[PDB]
């Protein structure tokens, strides 16, 4: 059972809007909105969205597998060996948020301070003592972006696995000689860094010049989660505030995806007339170029929605019904909707490009969608005894002042996959977990969970106290 199976199962259910059913429903972890900092929903005057993996949740593992296949085919097309075609995407290997070390060709899972939690070279998981030869302090400087790439998005899941496939392949292929920083093939040397750049370039190519979008829109039922409760929630948001879309995707792709997401024989509720997707938004903005969007952005353009092309010129006019914007900046939203940052709840899946930057640069309120939580929540509750034992071993070890702690850690971790939970390895939290807590005011497996809370709900989190204040 993948996380998108869970999401689709919940998506197939109709909305029972009886108040008692809602309060009962939101009590379950799977339909709950989790709270890092308190948020009074009554103060939210605008609800903003991105599209990919928020409104349009791509089904797993089918969509990752499609991206993987097209990326592999692109690398073979530009000269990588034919054996790449025998790879097959494996969803049990990658966890989101790993760091690829382009110097030594390792995938690393790290905590918020750069400490190594897991290190894998190809499919070989390197134990603590052996990692010290390359990482003397079992530590990396995350900000060295020339060396380290953080695979933070769900679009990065296929290349996370592909990097490991490639390192495994070249390590074990007799044509090549393994070296510390790459592979030697006579008079040719392929560094892990150039290999990584080829993979990155190929992933980009597949999304923007290849056939990924075409293959997606020709079979949207296979590739995109669909929920009849989406127009109900958006119609309810529009009753109490304004609603906007700000996506990096272009208008033609947005229109195809959004049309599918709203393709029901009804509108907000069963029995109601169908309405076009654009009617649910007070402001539609494509080609957003986030995260630059939250700084100076780009010039504001207007989409000719008949042709899908940009009109000639910078758009200088006002908000008009039916207009579609392109580029601009977050100040465009605030100006055209008459909003301040804390009036806005921005709902997205990119922990950096959506959530971190809108929080840090503009003081927007933030809702992080984490699709994998729809399944991680099931593992967490089902194996709570593993974690509880780990807590007790940690307390026992501290007051006593080992191999049992590592074994339980491994067993707990493997329930999530070969690279463990998105949020921790054993008792140690990941960088990703830390960023969620620090920058996502609210988070959930799906933003649909807002449907189960009344219009003026007060999301509450306990106040933080310093050690000397307790």
Indicate the residue among 221 and 462 with the shorter CB distance to its own copies. 462
Ranges within 181-210 binding its own copies (CB under 8 A): 183, 185-191, 194
Question: Which helix (H) or strand (E) covers residue 128, if one does?
Answer: helix 128-131
**Residue 138 interacting with its own copies (CB under 8 A):** yes
Token representation of residue 119:
């290190």
**Residue 141 interacting with its own copies (CB under 8 A):** yes
- DSSP string spanning 9-69? HHHHSPP---HHHHHHHHHSGGGPPEESS-EEGGG--EEEE-SBTTTB-B-TTHHHHHHHH
Smallest separation, CB 383 to its own copies (Å): 12
Smallest separation, CB 467 to its own copies (Å): 4
Q: How far apart are CA 183 and CA 167, in angstroms?
A: 9
Token representation of residue 385:
């005894």
Ranges within 439-468 binding its own copies (CB under 8 A): 443, 456, 458, 460-461, 463-464, 466-468
Binding residue for its own copies (CB under 8 A) from 127, 296, 312, 403? 312
DSSP 166: H
**Residue 146 interacting with its own copies (CB under 8 A):** no
Binding residue for its own copies (CB under 8 A) from 2, 5, 8, 35? 35
Q: CB-side exposure of 1: number of CA atoms within 13 Å?
A: 13
Binding residue for its own copies (CB under 8 A) from 3, 15, 31, 34? 34
Phi, psi for residue 398 in degrees, rounded to 5: -65, -45
Name the CA dihedral angle for 316, 317, 321, 323, rounded to a multiple of 10 degrees.
Answer: -20
Indicate the residue among 90 and 292 with the shorter CB distance to its own copies. 292
Smallest separation, CB 113 to its own copies (Å): 7
Stretch touching its own copies by CB under 8 A, among 32-40, 121-129, 214-222, 274-282? 32-40
Are 32 and 26 within 8 A, CB to CB?
A: yes
Length of the chain: 470
Smallest separation, CB 413 to its own copies (Å): 15
Q: CB-side exposure of 384: number of CA atoms within 13 Å?
A: 4
Q: How far apart are CA 167 and CA 178, in angstroms?
A: 10
Smallest separation, CB 369 to its own copies (Å): 13
Smallest separation, CB 396 to its own copies (Å): 13
Ranges within 96-115 binding its own copies (CB under 8 A): 113-115
DSSP 310: B
Are 444 and 369 within 8 A, CB to CB?
A: yes
Smallest separation, CB 169 to its own copies (Å): 12
Q: How far apart are CA 10 and CA 31, in angstroms?
A: 9
Ranges within 360-379 binding its own copies (CB under 8 A): 360-363, 373, 377
**Residue 147 interacting with its own copies (CB under 8 A):** no
**Residue 302 interacting with its own copies (CB under 8 A):** yes
**Residue 19 interacting with its own copies (CB under 8 A):** no
**Residue 9 interacting with its own copies (CB under 8 A):** no
Ranges within 397-416 binding its own copies (CB under 8 A): 398, 401
Indicate the residue among 266 and 361 with the shorter CB distance to its own copies. 361
Smallest separation, CB 5 to its own copies (Å): 19
Question: Which helix (H) or strand (E) covers residue 443, if one does?
Answer: strand 442-444
The crossing angle, in degrees rounded to 10, of helices 157-172 and 62-77 is 50
**Residue 23 interacting with its own copies (CB under 8 A):** no
């Amino acid at each position: 059972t993948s996380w998108s199976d869970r999401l689709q199962n919940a998506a197939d259910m109709p909305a029972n809007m009886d108040k008692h059913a809602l309060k009962k429903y939101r009590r379950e972890a799977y339909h709950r909105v989790f709270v890092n900092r308190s948020l009074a929903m009554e103060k939210i005057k605008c609800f903003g969205f991105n599209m990919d993996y928020t409104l349009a949740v791509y089904k797993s593992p089918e969509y990752e597998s499609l991206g993987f296949e097209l990326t592999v085919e692109r690398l073979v097309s530009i000269g990588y060996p034919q054996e790449l075609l025998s790879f097959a995407y494996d969803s049990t290997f990658p966890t989101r948020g790993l760091v690829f070390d382009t110097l030594y060709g390792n995938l690393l899972k790290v905590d918020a301070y750069g400490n190594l939690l897991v290190c894998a070279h190809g499919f070989n998981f390197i134990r603590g003592p052996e990692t010290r030869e390359q990482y003397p302090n079992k530590f990396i400087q995350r900000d060295d972006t020339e060396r380290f790439y953080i695979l933070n998005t769900l679009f990065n899941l296929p290349e996370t696995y592909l990097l490991a496939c490639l390192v495994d392949f070249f390590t074990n292929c007799p044509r090549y000689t393994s070296c510390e920083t790459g592979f030697k093939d006579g008079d040719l040397f392929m560094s892990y860094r150039s290999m990584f750049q080829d993979v990155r370039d190929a992933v980009d190519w597949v999304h923007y010049k290849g056939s990924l979008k075409e293959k997606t829109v020709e079979n949207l039922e296979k590739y995109v989660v669909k929920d009849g409760k989406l127009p109900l929630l958006l119609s309810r948001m529009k009753e109490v505030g304004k609603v906007f879309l700000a996506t990096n995707s272009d208008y033609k792709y947005t229109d195809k995806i959004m049309t599918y997401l709203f393709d029901f024989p009804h509108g907000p509720k069963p029995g109601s007339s169908h309405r076009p997707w654009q009617s649910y938004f007070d402001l539609i903005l494509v080609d957003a170029r986030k995260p630059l969007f939250f700084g100076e952005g780009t010039v504001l353009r207007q989409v000719d929605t008949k042709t899908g092309k940009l009109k000639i010129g910078t758009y200088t006019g006002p908000l008009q019904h039916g207009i579609v914007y392109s580029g601009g900046s977050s100040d465009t939203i605030c100006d055209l909707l008459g909003a301040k940052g804390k009036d806005i709840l921005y709902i997205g899946d990119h922990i950096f490009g959506d959530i971190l930057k809108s929080k840090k640069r503009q003081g927007w309120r933030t809702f992080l969608v984490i699709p994998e939580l729809a399944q991680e929540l099931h593992v967490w509750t089902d194996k709570s005894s593993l974690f509880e034992e780990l807590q007790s071993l940690d307390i026992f070890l501290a007051e006593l002042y080992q191999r049992r702690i590592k074994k339980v850690t491994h067993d707990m971790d493997m329930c999530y996959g070969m690279m463990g939970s998105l949020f921790r390895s054993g008792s140690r939290q990941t960088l990703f977990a830390s960023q969620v807590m620090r920058y996502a005011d609210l988070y959930a497996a799906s933003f649909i969970n807002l449907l189960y809370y009344p219009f003026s709900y007060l999301f509450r989190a306990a106040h933080v106290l310093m050690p000397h204040e307790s």
